[PDB]
């Protein structure tokens, strides 16, 4: 191109970031909500052939026993910030002997978004930004929390968020089915029915991944049989 | 069509189009206001709509026990400059054992922000700042732009449709230099209540307030603590 | 080594000996310890010869380059400060013990000292070297305000001679230089020209 | 030499709902005295406090580093720092200069997150441990045994295990410091005490022997 | 011109570095900043326009104290000019640290002009857009006034008129005797000049800045007192009509 | 390895102000080489300093402090430095330079007069810093501090003249029982007006004990 | 200092003392020398405490990162190799270290010995400190793979007590641990002033 | 040095260099792989007869270690470089850890390499 990367448009907005955010809407759909006793996270997997055992398709990972994450967009550039998250969490536990909150983690992870430039930029650095949307989740000193991220370093706290291609239908159908005193069962049922509504396949018992975090237990990723009892309805 | 891609080429009319394009960004967010009195300084921010595309944003930050800021554009650059200021203040306190003034900090900010406006492949910080503090010389309010040109102001607003707030401020000026805290806060709120589209009046979940002075270490006010300040407001005419 | 510098109204006077030594053997007996730096500014070397020569050459280069721009005769404080910095930045590797003297149109004749540390002091007269300890009492009892030129010349000559008899690391020929507004004048003393003092005998 | 011996002792005690940190207020060097007013106790938060002794120039630049790191943590995490985190940070701060270390003996005191008392002892390289009482400094050897006897009830028979109070510990430390001044030379000229409890901090000063 | 004006490393057919003309075109849109030198010192008469009066009196200052004995008056972009002020301060501090006396003015002008001209050759930088003036006075030498353009030229003057009104103002300094009258009876001439040159319809209002150096300030560069600014303004307002 | 050195320095604070005293000698080992040099300076209108030890490092610090103050007195903002900031800067400089094994062989004494409050500091080659109403470097710590202490323990409110006379007395004693001194010492003061320096002075002396 | 360790049918046994001196002055008498690296591994302190703590906290950090990246728990041999390789960079600078890594993996029990010089060796019986020679002699008369847990406990107690009765820089309390296939557990923190009565003393 | 941001975005994300690279992979000697309960097989097709050729020199299949193998279907020089670096890593791992590698490990290594070269400057 003939326009550089660190440029502005006649609207105050950068170009490459406005272009990368136009990619997130080409990824899979992810959902995350919070309650007074736990957070739930769910993600869809778009397999392509009866082969390619989906056991390898992993889109929900463990930043720590009390913190998880879910990604959408370019899954490649995603596995560069997860190692940084784990590194920072362990470095904190090593220096201070305690657990890192969620806000600190998300801030440290988002500080690395707008580091890029065609010039020196301390060689060994980035030539372009990451195309990925991240949704964190976990318990900390002040109840269950939840956050959100975008490829511009503009994270924001939320309570029920949905990203992916069809991120509108899963929000207009999420503004009315939420109340501040909902439990985990109905939460997961609502998430699963709206996923069903937005899914492209017949919602098999293995076309999706799910996880929960509540104070008592740690990060627990569900099995295949547990995902059966719930789908019976 | 060819001078509008780099921060180095001059236009035949003596203008650099890229810095104008950057300044066009600060005039896209939500409005913010800052003012001062004989012994107190105030900053107010107007988080918008609180649920959709602006669910929960933070437009006020703590820099030091006598300096605070409010931002009006990009956020990553804002955090960058914020960390810069914090480190400079900590260095001054570690070396001389005394708080750093405000004018010198603004000078350093301008010196840092002016560099990328000269050389190749760089871009200027697309953020406008409103700074408040109190030093031995009394209270101080400053305004900073993308172009490294800083101003000192008696009362200033930055953000979307802030011209009406400018008019209002210029209207009721001499009333200042005599009013106390609550009065200044009510003034600022009645001022920024104009930017709204004749609807969606103020609430306790959109306004953020920061206050500083001779007996305050730049206190902040969350969503719940504005209610005692929100009273005393008349209905929009 | 033994170097001496004196100041009078319209100029200055310098004085030095002519011996070099590497133990108890004399490698040279005529060496010149008066090194010009500009048309009207001089120096006086002591200690190691290599370091003194290097420092003086570099100062001469810098001062010529600095004077060719301003289009004005330089000052003595300038050269003295250059010496100060060069000998203070390397005080752990050098042994110089230098003196500066000269003339300039703003102030009259000027003298400065610069010992091994890297200091800088101006004084009505100055001395340096190993054989100076033996005359610290003679310059004190003879100096007087209001001295003319010839007086300073013979004073420096006598002091040098008295230092070159008791010290084994100094002797030979006595070199002198008189500086003023009109120009410079050099001079050399040897043999029957040097003073003599009768030796005590019982 | 890059080191100096300035003298100074420190004492700390814990309890169920309070902590105490006592020290001298004298600065010497060699056979002479520099000043008689230079305290060691330092306040970091409304619930934790520190004490340092040894080489002055090393005990004066570490406090600033800790203060700065506390401010930066408060700015980054949006909350203050507890006691254990302070100790875990100081260990690394000391171990950074391992082959060119400090020469200061630190002792931390404060309240546990539950509301109880906590004291942590350190060493110039960064090895710390939690305790009930410690007397690091120039006079540790004189004080540790007396504290062992009068707070652990060792080498005693048929002695109850009554708890400790505030006034009791205050009187005990006062008498101890009164005793240790007649036999040590680097100790005297003042006494300072800092108490930390569920309602904040208190400071007290006491006169001692001159010599 | 197709692409001969996109870089500072390109000569046009007739021979011209267009990017420097395009820069200096910026100072032709700023306020006038004249200054003169009679017999014992320099005097600047910068004028700063009033915009968004919510500001304080003393913002956007255009008169820096570069050093204990020299003063600067700028015209054009303020950021670049502040950078150049820092450059001059550093130069004058290093000179003193290395030699041991207050730097003269010719050398300062030449050094800063070299720095400014370093940017008129490569393509990795942008020519400055400020054209300023330096003033000083000493006892050995006398009064010294200079001027610099974005290209790197340094000439010595008796009177300059940097600003958009480069013409129609120099003439008003010719009739004056810029070598005989003392540094006390010229503030009035400078003030009435910058007052009658100002247009009252194209611009709302302005404020007047000043400075002083010479034997009265003992070589020190300081602002002009207000007790005399009062009578200066009175003289101007009475002379205009 | 310091070659040309300076001897003890004195400082005492009276009511509303402070006073300092220092001799004039660049002794080289055991030789009295230079005898008309000043070891006291004037940073600004409300701060003054004194040094012992090597004389070249003193000049270096003098130059740097002067340039700092000049850089401060250019902008024009109503602010300025106070003795506390100078003290902190000096302490940090000495510590940072010693941590690299290239120290400054000097011992600094700082006076000052802020708004209603005085100051009197102490700085060493290693970074040891403290304050007090009186102090002294070198042998002055054994022959002078005791007198000052004994005089303050009974009257901790001193007038200008009292401080001046006590300073003269301790300087006399130093000249008697010290081997690297001289009878040419300056005595500087700092009041609410500003800083002032008295020229070369000399003390009275008695030797009748030599007749026994 | 005094530490011992030995493995047999029912797993590994570890033990140490609770004393810490600075020359001839006893600074501490309640130290914890069995570092709890994790719910799966164990450590041991001897020489310099700061080093034996720092360089094993770092090892805990690295083992956790490994478990996170690879979804499989680390072994003992890899742990010892990591520690040795990270410590070999500081050869000849002043580090003092002696440690035992104890645990259980798919290869069965595991006991390794490491120091700052660089040597890394397995074994079935180890003792370290200024009083390991007095402990070897009594552990060698009574050791047997086919031991019962109670007798092994008694043997460890007895060895530590007899080593303490002779070495001056060793004494205080005896803290005994035990590692099993599903983690480890703490057993007791007996005091020497009370064992002297139970035993023939 | 060199830095020009070779790989960049587009109006729809659509990194064009990657699209072009995989369009090249759209050629290059199709390969095949299979996994059984007892055996793993993998083959590849030769594009030319080339009687004069020495087969052992032009082999597509290779070995990273006694446990692992691999094929490829694009350019040959880049493949050689990748294989060499993977061999280096598989040999360094067995040094630190006292056990061989798994397949996921080396696969993740290889893919992180390609990602880094997809994001870096001048590459």
Domain limits, chain C: 1-202
Whether chain A has a CB inside 8 Å of the CB on G86: the answer is no
Euclidean distance between CA atoms B134 and B83, whole angstroms: 20
User: Chain D: nearest CA to B90, how far in angstroms?
Assistant: 7
Task: List % helix, strand, coil for chain E (3-state, nearest 5).
Answer: 30, 15, 55
Q: What SS3 class is residue B165? A: helix
State the DSSP H helix or E strand holding residue H15, giving kind and residue range, or none if neither: none
Q: Which structural technique was applied?
A: cryo-EM
State the DSSP H helix or E strand holding residue C9, giving kind and residue range, or none if neither: none
Structure tokens at A35: 């309650």
Q: What SS3 class is residue A211? A: strand
Tell me the torsion sign for CA atoms D49, D50, D56, D61.
negative
Beta strands in chain G (DSSP E): 2-8, 11-16, 20-22, 25-28, 98-105, 108-115, 120-122, 125-129, 173-180, 183-191
Active site residues of C: 1
Structure tokens at B201: 């009046």
Euclidean distance between CA atoms G48 and G33, whole angstroms: 11
Kindly report the CATH number that applies to the domain delimited by G1-200: 3.60.20.10
- Nearest residue to G64 (alpha-carbon basis) of G40, G32, G35: G40
Euclidean distance between CA atoms F82 and F45, whole angstroms: 10
- Nearest residue to E134 (alpha-carbon basis) of E154, E120, E150, E114: E154
User: Is G153 exposed, middle or buried (CB count within 10 Å of its CB: 0-12, 13-18, 19+)?
Assistant: middle
User: Chain H: nearest CA to G37, how far in angstroms?
Assistant: 19
Euclidean distance between CA atoms E41 and B133, whole angstroms: 39
- The CATH number given to whatever domain includes residue D106 is 3.60.20.10
User: Chain C, 111-130: which have a CB under 8 Å from a chain F CB?
Assistant: 115-121
Q: What angle do CA A162, A163, A167 make, to 5 degrees?
A: 80
Q: Where are the alpha helices (DSSP H) in chain E?
A: 18-24, 78-98, 105-117, 171-174, 187-196, 226-239
Structure tokens at E162: 């940097």
For chain F, how far is it from start to end, CA to CA, in angstroms? 43
- For β-strands F18-23 and F9-12, DSSP reports them as antiparallel
**What b/e readout covers C79-107, taking b as 16+ CB neighbours within 10 angstroms?**
bbbbbbbbbbeebeebebbbbbbbbbeee
**What b/e readout covers A20-51, taking b as 16+ CB neighbours within 10 angstroms?**
bbbbbbebbbbbbbbbeebbbbbbbeeeeeee
Hunting for tokens 């940190």 — which residue is that? D21
- For β-strands H40-44 and A144-145, DSSP reports them as unpaired
Domains and CATH numbers, chain F: 1-212 (3.60.20.10)
* Packing angle, helices E78-98 and F56-75, rounded to 10: 160
Q: Measured in whole angstroms, how far is the alpha carbon of residue C90 from the centre of its chain?
A: 22
Q: Do A104 and D76 touch (CB under 8 A)?
A: yes
User: Chain B: nearest CA to D194, how far in angstroms?
Assistant: 24
- C155 Cβ neighbours under 8 A, 6+ residues apart: C6, C142, C147
Structure tokens at C36: 């010009």
- Nearest residue to B134 (alpha-carbon basis) of B74, B180, B233, B66: B66
CATH 3.60.20.10 fits C1-202, yes or no: yes
Could you tell me which residues of G are annotated as the binding site for bortezomib?
Answer: 49
Q: Do G48 and D125 touch (CB under 8 A)?
A: yes
Hunting for tokens 């049989």 — which residue is that? A225
Whether chain D has a CB inside 8 Å of the CB on A95: the answer is yes
C20 within 8 A of C26, measured Cβ to Cβ: yes
Integer angstrom CA distances of residue G146 from G8, G127, G140, G151: 7, 20, 14, 11
Euclidean distance between CA atoms C46 and C41, whole angstroms: 17
Name beta bridge partners: F197.
F188
Euclidean distance between CA atoms G151 and G143, whole angstroms: 10
From the CB of residue B53, how many other CB atoms can be counted at a distance below 10 Å?
8
Q: What SS3 class is residue A203? A: coil
Question: What residue spans define the domains of chain G?
Answer: 1-200
**What b/e readout covers B214-229, taking b as 16+ CB neighbours within 10 angstroms?**
eeeebeebeeeebeeb
For residue A103, the chain D residues in CB contact (below 8 A) are 77-78
Q: Where are the alpha helices (DSSP H) in chain A?
A: 16-24, 81-96, 102-110, 169-172, 184-198, 226-231
Question: Domain total for chain A?
Answer: 1
Structure tokens at A109: 């992870």
For residue F152, the chain D residues in CB contact (below 8 A) are none
State the DSSP H helix or E strand holding residue B84, giving kind and residue range, or none if neither: helix B76-95
User: Is A146 exposed, middle or buried (CB count within 10 Å of its CB: 0-12, 13-18, 19+)?
Assistant: buried
Q: Which CATH architecture has domain E1-241?
A: 4-Layer Sandwich (3.60)
Nearest to G68 among A86, A91, A94 (CB): A86
Whether chain G has a CB inside 8 Å of the CB on A83: the answer is yes
User: Chain D: nearest CA to F34, how far in angstroms?
Assistant: 29
Hunting for tokens 């736990």 — which residue is that? A38
**What b/e readout covers B156-194, taking b as 16+ CB neighbours within 10 angstroms?**
bbbbbebebbbebbeeeeeebeeeeeeebbbbbbbbbbb
Structure tokens at F173: 């004693």
Q: Where are the alpha helices (DSSP H) in chain H?
A: 16-25, 76-96, 103-119
Tell me the torsion sign for CA atoms E198, E203, E204, E208.
negative
User: Is B200 exposed, middle or buried (CB count within 10 Å of its CB: 0-12, 13-18, 19+)?
Assistant: exposed
Q: Measured in whole angstroms, how far is the alpha carbon of residue C22 from the centre of its chain?
A: 21
Q: What is B1-234's CATH topology?
A: 3.60.20
Whether chain C has a CB inside 8 Å of the CB on E140: the answer is yes
For residue D126, the chain G residues in CB contact (below 8 A) are 50, 54
Give the range of the structural domain holding residue D110, as residue numbers without chain letter. 1-211
Please report all neighbours of H, defined by 3+ CB atom pairs within 8 A: A, G
Plot region of A52 (φ>0 → left; ψ -120 to 50 → alpha; else → beta): left
The 8-class DSSP code of residue E168 comes to T
Integer angstrom CA distances of residue A106 from A59, A75, D77: 18, 18, 11
Please report all neighbours of C, defined by 3+ CB atom pairs within 8 A: E, F
Integer angstrom CA distances of residue G123 from C151, G6, G100, G101, G153: 96, 8, 10, 11, 19
- G28 Cβ neighbours under 8 A, 6+ residues apart: D129, G19, G20
- Nearest residue to B236 (alpha-carbon basis) of B194, B192, B207, B203: B194
Q: Rounded to 10 degrees, what is the CA torsion of E26, E28, E29, E30?
A: 100
E138 within 8 A of E69, measured Cβ to Cβ: yes
Chains D and F touch (3+ CB pairs under 8 A): yes
């Amino acid at each position: 191109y003939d326009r550089g990367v660190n440029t502005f448009s006649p609207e105050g907005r950068l170009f490459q970031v406005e272009y990368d955010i136009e990619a997130i809407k080409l990824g899979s759909t992810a959902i995350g909500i919070q309650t007074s006793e736990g957070v739930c996270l769910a993600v869809e997997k778009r397999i392509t052939s009866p082969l390619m055992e989906p056991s390898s398709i992993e889109k929900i990972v463990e930043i720590d026993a009390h913190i998880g994450c879910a990604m959408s967009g370019l899954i490649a550039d995603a596995k560069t910030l997860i190692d940084k998250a784990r590194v920072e969490t362990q470095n904190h536990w090593f220096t201070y002997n305690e657990t890192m909150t969620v806000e600190s983690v998300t801030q440290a992870v988002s500080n690395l978004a707008l580091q890029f430039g065609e010039e020196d930029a301390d060689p060994g650095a980035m030539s372009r930004p990451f195309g990925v949307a991240l949704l964190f989740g976990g318990v900390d000193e002040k109840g269950p929390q939840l956050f959100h991220m975008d490829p511009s370093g503009t994270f924001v706290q939320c309570d029920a968020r949905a990203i992916g291609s069809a991120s509108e239908g899963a929000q207009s159908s999420l503004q009315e089915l939420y109340h501040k005193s909902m439990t985990l069962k109905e939460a997961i049922k609502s998430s699963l029915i709206i996923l069903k509504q937005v899914m492209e396949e017949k919602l098999n018992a293995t076309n999706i991944e799910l996880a929960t975090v509540q104070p008592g237990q740690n990060f627990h990723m569900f099995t295949k049989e547990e995902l059966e009892e719930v789908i019976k309805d | 069509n060819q001078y509008d891609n780099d921060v180095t080429v001059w236009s035949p009319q003596g203008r650099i189009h890229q810095i104008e394009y950057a300044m066009e960004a600060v005039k896209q967010g939500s409005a913010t206001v800052g003012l001062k009195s004989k012994t107190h300084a105030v900053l107010v921010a107007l988080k918008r709509a609180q649920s959709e595309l602006a669910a929960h944003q933070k437009k006020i930050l703590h820099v030091d026990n006598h300096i605070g800021i409010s931002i009006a554009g990009l956020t990553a650059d804002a955090r960058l400059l914020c960390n810069f200021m914090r480190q400079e203040c900590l260095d001054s306190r570690f070396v001389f054992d005394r708080p750093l003034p405000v004018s010198r900090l603004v000078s350093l900010i301008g010196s840092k922000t002016q560099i990328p406006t000269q050389r190749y492949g760089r871009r200027p910080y697309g953020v406008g700042l409103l700074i408040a503090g109190y030093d031995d010389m009394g209270p101080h309010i400053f305004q900073t732009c993308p172009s490294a040109n800083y101003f000192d102001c008696r009362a200033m607003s930055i953000g979307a449709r802030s011209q009406s707030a400018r008019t209002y401020l210029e209207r009721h000026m001499s009333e200042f230099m005599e009013c106390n805290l609550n009065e200044l806060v009510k003034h600022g709120l009645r001022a920024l209540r104009e930017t709204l589209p004749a609807e969606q009046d103020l609430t306790t979940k959109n306004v953020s307030i920061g206050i500083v002075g001779k007996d305050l270490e730049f206190t902040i006010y969350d969503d719940d603590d504005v209610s005692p300040f929100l009273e005393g407001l008349e209905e929009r005419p | 080594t033994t170097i001496m510098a004196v100041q009078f109204d319209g100029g200055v006077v310098l004085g030095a000996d002519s011996r070099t030594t590497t133990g108890s053997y004399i490698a040279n007996r005529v060496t010149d310890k008066l090194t010009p730096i500009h048309d009207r500014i001089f120096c006086c070397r002591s200690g190691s010869a290599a370091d003194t020569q290097a420092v003086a050459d570099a100062v001469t280069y810098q001062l010529g380059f600095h004077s060719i721009e301003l289009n004005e005769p330089p000052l003595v404080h300038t050269a003295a400060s250059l010496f100060k910095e060069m000998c203070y930045r390397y005080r752990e590797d050098l042994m110089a013990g230098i003196i500066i003297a000269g003339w300039d149109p703003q102030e009259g004749g000027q003298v400065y000292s610069v010992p091994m540390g890297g200091m800088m002091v101006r004084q009505s007269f100055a001395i340096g070297g190993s054989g100076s300890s033996y005359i610290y009492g003679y310059v004190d009892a003879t100096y007087r305000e209001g001295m003319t030129k010839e007086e300073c010349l013979q004073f420096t000559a006598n002091a040098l001679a008295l230092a070159m008899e008791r010290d084994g690391s100094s002797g030979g020929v006595i070199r002198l230089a008189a500086i003023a507004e009109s120009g410079v004048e050099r001079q050399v003393l040897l043999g029957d020209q040097i003073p003599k003092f009768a030796v005590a005998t019982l | 030499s890059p080191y100096v011996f300035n003298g100074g002792t420190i004492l700390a005690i814990a309890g169920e709902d309070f902590a105490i940190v006592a020290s001298d207020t004298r600065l010497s060097e060699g056979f002479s005295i520099h000043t008689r007013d230079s305290p060691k106790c330092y306040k970091l938060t409304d619930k934790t406090v520190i004490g340092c002794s040894g080489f002055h120039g090393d005990c004066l630049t570490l406090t600033k580093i800790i203060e700065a790191r506390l401010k930066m943590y408060k700015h980054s995490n949006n909350k203050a720092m507890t006691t254990g985190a302070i100790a875990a940070m100081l260990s690394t701060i000391l171990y950074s200069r391992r082959f060119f270390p400090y020469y200061v003996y630190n002792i931390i005191g404060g309240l546990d997150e539950e509301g109880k008392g906590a004291v942590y002892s350190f060493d110039p390289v960064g090895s710390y441990q939690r305790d009930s009482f410690k007397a690091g400094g120039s006079a540790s050897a004189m004080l540790q045994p007396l504290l062992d006897n009068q707070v652990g009830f060792k080498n005693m028979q048929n002695v109850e295990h009554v708890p400790l109070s505030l006034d009791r510990a205050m009187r005990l430390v006062k008498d101890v410091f009164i005793s240790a001044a007649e036999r040590d030379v680097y100790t005297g000229d003042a006494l300072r005490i800092c108490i930390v409890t569920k309602e904040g901090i208190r400071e007290e000063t006491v006169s001692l022997r001159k010599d | 011109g197709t692409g001969y004006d996109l870089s500072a490393s390109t000569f046009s057919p007739d021979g011209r570095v267009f990017q420097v003309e395009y820069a200096m075109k910026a100072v032709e849109n700023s306020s006038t900043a004249i200054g003169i030198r009679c017999k014992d010192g320099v005097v600047f008469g910068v004028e700063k326009l009033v915009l968004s009066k919510l500001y304080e009196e003393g913002s956007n200052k255009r008169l820096f104290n570069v050093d204990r004995h020299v003063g600067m008056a700028v015209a054009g972009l303020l950021a670049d000019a502040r950078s150049l002020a820092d450059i001059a301060r550093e130069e004058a501090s290093n000179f003193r640290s290395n030699f041991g006396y207050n730097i003269p003015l010719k050398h300062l002008a030449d050094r800063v002009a070299m720095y400014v001209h370093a940017y008129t050759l490569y393509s990795a930088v942008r020519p400055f857009g400020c054209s300023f003036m330096l003033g000083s006075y000493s006892v050995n030498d006398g009064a010294q006034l200079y001027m610099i353009d974005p290209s790197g030229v340094s000439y010595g003057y008796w009177g300059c008129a940097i600003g958009k009104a480069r013409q129609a103002a120099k003439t008003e300094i010719e009739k004056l005797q810029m070598k005989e009258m003392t540094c006390r009876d010229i503030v009035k001439e400078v003030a009435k000049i910058i007052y009658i040159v100002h247009d009252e319809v194209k611009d709302k209002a302005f404020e007047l800045e000043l400075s002083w150096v010479g034997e009265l300030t003992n070589g020190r560069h300081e602002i002009v007192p207000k007790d005399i600014r009062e009578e200066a303004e009175k003289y101007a307002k009475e002379s205009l009509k | 390895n310091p070659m040309v050195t300076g001897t003890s320095v004195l400082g005492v604070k009276f009511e509303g102000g402070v006073v300092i005293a220092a001799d004039m000698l660049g002794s080289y080992g055991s030789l009295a080489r230079f005898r008309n040099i000043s070891r006291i300076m004037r940073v600004n209108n409300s701060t003054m300093l004194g040094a012992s030890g090597d004389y070249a490092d003193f000049q270096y610090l003098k130059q740097v402090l002067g340039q700092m103050v000049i850089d401060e007195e250019l902008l024009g903002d109503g602010h300025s430095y106070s003795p506390r900031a100078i003290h902190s800067w000096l302490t940090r400089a000495m510590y940072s330079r010693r941590s690299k094994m290239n120290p400054l062989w000097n011992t600094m004494v700082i006076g000052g007069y802020a708004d209603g409050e005085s100051f009197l500091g102490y700085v060493d080659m290693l970074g040891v810093a403290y304050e007090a109403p009186s102090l002294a470097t070198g042998y002055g710590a054994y022959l002078a501090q005791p007198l000052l202490r004994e005089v303050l323990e009974k009257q901790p409110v001193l007038s200008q003249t009292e401080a001046r006379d006590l300073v003269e007395r301790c300087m006399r004693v130093l000249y008697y029982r010290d081997a690297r001194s001289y009878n040419r010492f300056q005595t500087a003061t700092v009041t609410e007006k500003g800083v002032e320096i008295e020229g070369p002075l000399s003390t009275e002396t008695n030797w009748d004990i030599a007749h026994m | 200092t005094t530490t011992l360790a030995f493995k047999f049918r029912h797993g590994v046994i570890v033990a140490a003392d609770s004393r810490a001196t600075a020359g001839a002055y006893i600074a501490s008498q309640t130290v914890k020398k069995v570092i709890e690296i994790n719910p799966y591994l164990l450590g041991t302190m001897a020489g310099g405490a700061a080093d034996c703590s720092f360089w094993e906290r770092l090892l805990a950090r690295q083992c956790r990162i490994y478990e996170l990246r690879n979804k499989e728990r680390i072994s003992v041999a890899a742990a010892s190799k990591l520690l040795a390789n990270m410590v070999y960079q500081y050869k000849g600078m002043g580090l003092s270290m002696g440690t035992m890594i104890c645990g259980w993996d798919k290869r069965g029990p595991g006991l390794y010995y490491v120091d700052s010089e660089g040597n890394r060796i397995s074994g079935a019986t180890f003792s370290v400190g200024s009083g390991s020679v007095y402990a070897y002699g009594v552990m060698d008369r009574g050791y047997s793979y086919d031991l019962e847990v109670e007798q092994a406990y008694d043997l460890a107690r007895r060895a530590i007590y007899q080593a303490t009765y002779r070495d001056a820089y060793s004494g205080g309390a005896v803290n005994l641990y035990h590692v099993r296939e599903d983690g480890w557990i703490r057993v007791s923190s007996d005091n020497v002033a009370d064992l002297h009565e139970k035993y023939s003393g | 040095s060199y830095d020009r941001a070779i790989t960049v975005f587009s109006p729809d994300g659509h990194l064009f260099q990657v699209e072009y690279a995989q369009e090249a992979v759209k050629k290059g000697s199709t390969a095949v792989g299979v996994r059984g309960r007892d055996i793993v097989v993998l083959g590849v097709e030769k594009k030319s007869v080339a009687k004069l050729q020495d087969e052992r020199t032009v082999r597509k299949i290779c070995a990273l270690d006694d446990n692992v193998c691999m094929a490829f279907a694009g350019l040959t020089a880049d493949a050689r470089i990748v294989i060499n670096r993977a061999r280096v890593e598989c040999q360094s791992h067995r040094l630190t850890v006292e056990d061989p590698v798994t397949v996921e490990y080396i696969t993740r290594y290889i893919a992180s390499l390609k990602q880094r070269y997809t994001q870096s400057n001048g590459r």
